[PDB]
Amino acid sequence: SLINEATLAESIRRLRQGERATLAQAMTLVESRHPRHQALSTQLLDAIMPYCGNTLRLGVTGTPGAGKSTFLEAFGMLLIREGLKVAVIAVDPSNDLARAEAAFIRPVPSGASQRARELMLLCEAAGYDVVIVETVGVGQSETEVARMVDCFISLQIAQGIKKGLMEVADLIVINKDDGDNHTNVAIARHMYESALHILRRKYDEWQPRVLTCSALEKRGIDEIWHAIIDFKTALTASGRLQQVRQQQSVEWLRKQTEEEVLNHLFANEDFDRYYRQTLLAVKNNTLSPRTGLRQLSEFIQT
Amino acid sequence: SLINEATLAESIRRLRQGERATLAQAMTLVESRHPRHQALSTQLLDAIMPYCGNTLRLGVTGTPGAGKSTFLEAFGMLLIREGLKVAVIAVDPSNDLARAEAAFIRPVPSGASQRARELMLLCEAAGYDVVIVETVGVGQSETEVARMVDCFISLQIAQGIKKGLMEVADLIVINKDDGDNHTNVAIARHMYESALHILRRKYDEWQPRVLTCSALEKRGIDEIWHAIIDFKTALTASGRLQQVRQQQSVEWLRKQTEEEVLNHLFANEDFDRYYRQTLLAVKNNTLSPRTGLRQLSEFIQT
Ligand SMILES: [Cl-]
Ligand SMILES: [Cl-]
Ligand SMILES: [Cl-]
Ligand SMILES: [Cl-]
Ligand SMILES: [Cl-]
Ligand SMILES: [Cl-]
Ligand SMILES: [Cl-]
Ligand SMILES: [Cl-]
Ligand code: NA
Ligand code: NA
């Protein structure tokens, strides 16, 4: 069926009934750069807001070689066996699940952060029980994913532990606990656990947990889902999950508003030039930082 | 002697010769809110920039009960015995050293960040060998101090370890390793060390060290100074210290420039109102985040 201004309400109806063709169509619309599609997309997203917010939002990162694909397939299939509908938003770095009718998989091209969030909203409005946003754990991708999900899960394989990961990890999982590397897996699991037991809790309500699994042998997956449920229980008992979700949305709005204002300034060719000359003046000991700041402020005011 | 526009150059001369009365006078001038003093202060700070930058800058935080005062006295007196001139900038939270002629102690009232930096510059121009900026370790004060010093030292006494501290600690010191609490001190020292050995290094060149001392018994202090020297050796071998200092100055300029622009916007009574109404519209599911952002952008442009 066509999606357009006249049919928007019926299209939303179809979407909320969980019709997969309409979900895919709506996502494609949201991804179009055609100015007309951008305005209709805006109408759609405004319209669906009341239908969002009753979906468990999970983030999953995996380092290269961590077995993210096999884990996601096993985990996804477990959720479907539990009778749940699961969507996977596969974000680009800066199988059996594919065949499941109760699943839905969509890639997000390398911003992509706003895009991932909007696609997640569509999945929520479509009645998915669990939405998983996943990407490679590299650079700061853990903290970026963490900011849009209820529960953040990092996959690791058996330099020290990344501090940014410690900041955001709710669960750490060591995949490929199979064959002959049990000891290597146990040592890695122990190391993450030492860090997560000694550092202050991200949430007062939750000691982060470190688990192991073998996706390809189907062991440990049930236990990971159970830990996620335990997390949900702990955070919802105090009303902290709702608070987290509100804080994430406020922080996104605030950060994007600030960043647009700042990007416009630092993009300006005249300001960029004056800024760089000011920096060089300070570096070369001709101006104090105080004076550097004042003249930047005056340039901005004028 | 008077400090004024006519005498500025001779006053700078006196300052560079290490005359303590002129240093105190210059600091008082920098702290005056009298508009005339603010302009002369600007001239002074510009003028001294070429004389700065050959001083070891240390940051020291202590938690309540960590023995910061006794440690600073013992440490300061050690440096003076080594024939060094040491200045202490005592920053407000958001003895024998006092009697030493080769020392200089100045408080900074509860911004205070810009003020601490400017007073540090005066000490550098005055020929101090070591300048120590110190404050209570509470909230985010560790990261704030860390951003203006060559080497950051945190005092702890025998909830888990603060992640912000792990981000910035170059050395951790457990004071009051005396009397009957050796075991309690050893356990605390071990805990910090576990975290600092397992987490990725802040600097590739340096594994953070955790030491113990008894300031009041004068034991362990020599070893702490030696560790600081080891830090300086490690970072200067690769040219990393110079890079750190440059990055700190650029980051301060950048952050203060951004924060002034943003504070003016979010201070604006009309924008604050529209921003809060937009936030509430999103919270109440009447607008998508996309639309929230767009209309904030339009409000700003207009
Ligand atoms: Cl079309
Ligand atoms: Cl804790
Ligand atoms: Cl909740
Ligand atoms: Cl300039
Ligand atoms: Cl006067
Ligand atoms: Cl490392
Ligand atoms: Cl260096
Ligand atoms: Cl509004
Ligand atoms: Na949210
Ligand atoms: Na600097």
| φ, ψ (nearest 5 deg) of residue B178 | -155, 165
Number of Cα atoms under 13 Å in the Cβ half of residue A256: 21
Q: Which amino acid is at A162?
A: K
CA distance B119 to B263: 25
Rounded Cα distance, B155 and B65, in Å = 10
How many C-beta atoms lie closer than 10 Å to residue A48's C-beta? 21
CATH 1.10.287.130, chain B: domain bounds: 238-302
Burial of A69 (0-12, 13-18, 19+ CB in 10 A): middle
The Å distance, Cα B281 to ligand 8 centre, comes to 5
> Whole-angstrom Cα distance, residue A68 to residue B289?
30
For residue B167 the two structure tokens come to 């981000």
Helix H, strand E, coil C: the string for B99-163 is CCCCEEEEEECCCHHHHHHHHHHHHHHCCCCEEEEEEECCCCHHHHHHCCCCEEEEEECCCCECH
Closest Cβ opposite residue A288 in set B45, B159, B292:
B45
In chain B, residues under CATH classification 3.40.50.300 are 53-237
Q: With beta carbons less than 8 A apart as the criterion, state whether A11 and A45 touch.
A: no
Cα–Cα separations (whole angstroms), residue B14 to B24, B26, B127, B236? 12, 11, 11, 31
Residue showing tokens 């550097």: A292
Smallest Cβ–Cβ distance between B297 and the set A50, A52, A260 belongs to A260
| A106 membership: H or E segment, kind and range | strand A103-108
Q: How many CB atoms lie within 10 A of CB A89?
A: 27
For residues B127 and B18, the answer to whether their CB atoms sit within 8 Å is yes
Looking at chain B, the domain(s) classified CATH 1.20.5.170 span: 1-52
Q: Known binding site for ATP: residues of A?
A: 62-69
Query: Which of A30, A43, A49, A277 is best to mutate for the B interface (most B CBs within 10 A)?
Result: A49
**Are residues B159 and A198 in contact, defined by beta-carbon separation less than 8 angstroms?**
no
Tokens standing for residue A292: 């550097």
Q: Which residues contact A254 (CB under 8 A, 6 or more apart)?
A: none
Are residues A208 and A172 in contact, defined by beta-carbon separation less than 8 angstroms? yes
Contact between residue B15 and residue B125 where contact means Cβ atoms under 8 Å apart = yes
Other C-beta atoms lying within 10 Å of the C-beta of residue A20: 13
Of B121, B290, B293, the CB nearest to A257: B293
CATH of domain A53-237: 3.40.50.300
Report the CATH number of the A1-52 domain: 1.20.5.170
**Cα separation, A161 vs A140, whole angstroms:** 13
Q: Residue A135 burial by CB count (10 A; 0-12/13-18/19+): exposed, middle or buried?
A: buried
- Comparing CA positions, the residue from B162, B174, B185, B235 lying closest to residue B210 is B174
The token pair that represents A300 in the structure block? 């901005």
- A254 — alpha (psi -120 to 50), left (phi > 0) or beta? alpha
CATH of domain A238-302: 1.10.287.130
Q: In chain A, what's the furthest Cα-to-Cα distance?
A: 69
Identify the CA nearest to B46 among candidates A284, A276, A296, A272: A284
Helix, coil or strand: residue A102:
coil
Q: How far is B213 from B12, CA to CA, in rounded Å? A: 40
Give the count of Cβ contacts less than 8 A between chain A and B.
148
Indicate yes or no: CB of A163 within 8 angstroms of CB of B162: no
Whether A200 sits inside 8 A of B117 (CB atoms) is no
E strands, B2-120, in order:
56-62, 86-91, 103-108
Proximal ligand: closest to the CA of A28: 1
Q: How far apart are CA B171 and CA A156, in angstroms?
A: 29
Inter-chain residue contact B197 with A160, CB threshold 8 Å: yes
B242-247 long-range contacts, CB within 8 A, separation 24+: B244/B150, B245/B53, B245/B150, B246/A283
Expressed in Å, this structure's resolution amounts to: 1.8
The answer to whether A110 touches A94, Cβ cutoff 8 Å, is yes
What is the length of chain B? 302
